[PDB]
């Protein structure tokens, strides 16, 4: 139900532009809470929660 991906590495800088987005610099390790959506995953980084593009990270 929450996808097969639990951990992922940021490939590119993602700039969060909205409150619900989880921004990161490339090389960050993201905990992936939900990977079921093909477009945007849900993650935890620095104890914050948010959405980020799935194609910006590598499992």
């Amino acid at each position: 139900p929450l996808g097969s991906v639990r951990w992922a590495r940021a490939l590119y800088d993602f700039e969060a532009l909205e409150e619900d987005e989880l921004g990161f610099r490339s090389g960050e390790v993201v905990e992936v809470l939900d990977s079921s959506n093909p477009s945007w995953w849900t993650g935890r980084l620095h104890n914050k929660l948010g959405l980020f593009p799935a194609n910006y990270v590598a499992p």
Binding site: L11, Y12, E18, D20, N37, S39, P53
Partner: peptide, 12 residues
């Protein structure tokens, strides 16, 4: 870096 499409963001 890939194009970003926010039209596909699901609710958090």
């Amino acid at each position: 870096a890939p194009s970003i499409d926010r039209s596909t963001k699901p609710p958090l």
